Structure 1
Amino acid sequence: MASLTEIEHLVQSVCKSYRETCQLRLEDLLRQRSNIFSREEVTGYQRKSMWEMWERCAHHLTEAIQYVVEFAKRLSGFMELCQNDQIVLLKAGAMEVVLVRMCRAYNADNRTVFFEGKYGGMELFRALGCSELISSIFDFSHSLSALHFSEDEIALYTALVLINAHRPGLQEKRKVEQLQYNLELAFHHHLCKTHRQSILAKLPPKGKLRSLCSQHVERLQIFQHLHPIVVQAAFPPLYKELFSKILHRLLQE
């Protein structure tokens, strides 16, 4: 099942599907690395209330997950799976896909990230009262930056993050397994061709992405307990769905 030419076609289809669905262009992100938030603007973010910061960030996370949903829909084999499985995959892998994609908006020279139009370090998010979570996200982004990923590599890697046959609650496990294998062949074939099989040992352990997503759900339950109405009234429906039937509607478009 799937010859040499079919693997090279899958490689190119995955690389195309990814370029079409990344929220921010790498060119644009790079042509902005100098637009850094001033000490005053940073103090402004630091002084904003916890609920204000949480709402802005949940809104930003929602926009990203939305482009990730569009990646999955454009991804070969995904829309052929049943609705239950498509939802199991996104509910579990969307956040993880955003966690990989965020390395493109990160600068390892000055340890900053792109946020609301400019770059700023960890201290920008002090008002969230996360600390450990913000550190973890920054460390994760730092470790992926070390890998010097090409766009095709993030494409192939993120497709595999999402197409996970081990996700609890899969109705047609074999059908996901076949797709994951094809995507594994494609990824490794591309790594082999480009002489980049080196990164294989250096890719993050599968439990690291799980740890980050878990910390997110734990820091949210803490916030939701202190500001329940802020979450019901000002948090996005799709965010509440994944982390607290938008998916069924987004997938049917």
Structure 2
Amino acid sequence: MASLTEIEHLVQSVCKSYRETCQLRLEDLLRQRSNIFSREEVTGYQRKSMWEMWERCAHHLTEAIQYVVEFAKRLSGFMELCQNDQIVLLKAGAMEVVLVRMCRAYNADNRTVFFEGKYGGMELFRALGCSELISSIFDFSHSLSALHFSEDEIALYTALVLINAHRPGLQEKRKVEQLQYNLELAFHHHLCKTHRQSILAKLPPKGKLRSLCSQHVERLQIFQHLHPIVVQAAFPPLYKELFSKILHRLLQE
């Protein structure tokens, strides 16, 4: 049950929820493309301490995940599932949603990402000691650039990243399956109607997004083992919660 109106109405409320919950405006990100970090500024970032860079990136990651919580809270029928399923979906999905959202701050053209006010390439994150991880993040953004996503496509796709009935630990598995289906119908209908069905074959596999979150938790478990007090005192609580009950607080406001 759902007609060609109830499926279409979902499309526009998904695009709306997404529009209203992005950390950065795409128009803004596009106009700052020529504001690039100097050779001296890149060298300043490389000279910064690993733990300083870690705290900066973790703070920025937390900043973005907070907007993913607001996207989830406005997503049709997400607030109607149980609190345990809301956390299950956000714990597993929020990072992946930022991993897709991230492509809007990318520029395949110059291979740079927007960070702390200006655009900069992979070598801006050398201090982190995440040679392969930052590389994967950059390649993942490069691959999504090739798809030339519309904002409405990013909205429907990210909503499907978050609404995954296959996430382990889901209590009302069928209530999440029912929701995932309507969003899939809304996405594929919008792709059909816009003559953009050809993207389906080119969307990244399920494992591309899964290995990225896993690599993040692996390098984090390494950094935390060498600087445990740095993570306790300077890392954000919601960051430590997601990768190391703030989510329950966010889910009420």
Deviations 1:96-146 (A, max 9, x none): 000000000000010000000000000000000001000000000000000
Count how many residue pairs are aligned between Structure 1 and Structure 2: 253
- Structure 1: 5+ residue stretches without partners: none
2:146 maps to 146
1:116 maps to 116
Local SS of the residue matching 2:120? strand
Shift in Å at residue 36 of structure 1?
0.2
- Report the Cα distance in structure 2 between the residues aligned to 1:173 and 1:201, rounded to whole angstroms: 27
Shift in Å at residue 47 of structure 1?
0.0
TM-score, scaled relative to structure 1: 1.00
Deviations 1:69-94 (A, max 9, x none): 00000000100000000000000000
Local SS of the residue matching 1:4? coil
Local SS of the residue matching 2:224? helix
Deviations 1:163-217 (A, max 9, x none): 0000000000000000000000000000000000000000000011000000000
Shift in Å at residue 230 of structure 1?
0.4
2:65 maps to 65
Shift in Å at residue 150 of structure 1?
0.1
2:6 maps to 6
- Report the Cα distance in structure 1 between the residues aligned to 2:177 and 2:245, rounded to whole angstroms: 26
- Structure 2: 5+ residue stretches without partners: none
Shift in Å at residue 2 of structure 1?
1.0
TM-score, scaled relative to structure 2: 1.00
- Report the Cα distance in structure 2 between the residues aligned to 1:220 and 1:23, rounded to whole angstroms: 24
- Report the Cα distance in structure 2 between the residues aligned to 1:244 and 1:106, rounded to whole angstroms: 27
- Report the Cα distance in structure 1 between the residues aligned to 2:183 and 2:134, rounded to whole angstroms: 31
Local SS of the residue matching 1:142? helix
1:49 maps to 49
2:220 maps to 220
- Report the Cα distance in structure 2 between the residues aligned to 1:88 and 1:217, rounded to whole angstroms: 17
Local SS of the residue matching 1:62? helix
- Report the Cα distance in structure 1 between the residues aligned to 2:32 and 2:101, rounded to whole angstroms: 17
- Report the Cα distance in structure 2 between the residues aligned to 1:34 and 1:196, rounded to whole angstroms: 30
Local SS of the residue matching 2:119? strand
- Report the Cα distance in structure 2 between the residues aligned to 1:15 and 1:144, rounded to whole angstroms: 18
- Report the Cα distance in structure 1 between the residues aligned to 2:205 and 2:22, rounded to whole angstroms: 24
Local SS of the residue matching 1:196? coil
Local SS of the residue matching 1:113? strand
Local SS of the residue matching 2:5? helix
- Report the Cα distance in structure 2 between the residues aligned to 1:134 and 1:8, rounded to whole angstroms: 37
- Report the Cα distance in structure 2 between the residues aligned to 1:2 and 1:159, rounded to whole angstroms: 18
- Report the Cα distance in structure 1 between the residues aligned to 2:75 and 2:42, rounded to whole angstroms: 39
Local SS of the residue matching 1:90? helix
- Report the Cα distance in structure 2 between the residues aligned to 1:3 and 1:207, rounded to whole angstroms: 33
Q: Percent sequence identity over matched residues? A: 100
1:187 maps to 187
- Report the Cα distance in structure 2 between the residues aligned to 1:109 and 1:10, rounded to whole angstroms: 34
Shift in Å at residue 35 of structure 1?
0.4
Local SS of the residue matching 1:168? coil
- Report the Cα distance in structure 2 between the residues aligned to 1:86 and 1:11, rounded to whole angstroms: 21
